[PDB]
Model the fold of this input.
Amino acid sequence: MELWLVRHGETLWNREGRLLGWTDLPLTAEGEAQARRLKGALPSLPAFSSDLLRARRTAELAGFSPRLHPELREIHFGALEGALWETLDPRYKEALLRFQGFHPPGGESLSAFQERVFRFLEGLKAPAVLFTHGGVVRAVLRALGEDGLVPPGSAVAVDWPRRVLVRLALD
Done:
């Protein structure tokens, strides 16, 4: 199934390097610029979006009127929301780098996050554009044998659940 996953534009915590999950930050001026650039670079397909502000705003600026789904939200970091990556305990850093065995207090485990994301994707019966988050895109890429956290305001098209089709980044 052809699915286009879009990572929302940048927020302040992108440059600050803080874990950004359910904290509802708005896009920065540049983030909105990145979103605008997506308009015309994404196919006209039904759209779904994380209900978090930065994702919804990215979808709007990209020219879409998506159906909101909490299932497309970034992982919930719990007590780690807002934590600087730099000073994150090595055990948490490794869990996030290896994408396994991560369950922050008051948050969501990586395995539960994956279950949530993949269950949502399984329900998509036709091609669509999904406005979402870095962790969601990473979960999909990693499950397809590819690594890397695509830049803010960029997109990746995949043939779910078989392979990545194209990675699209604009300047």
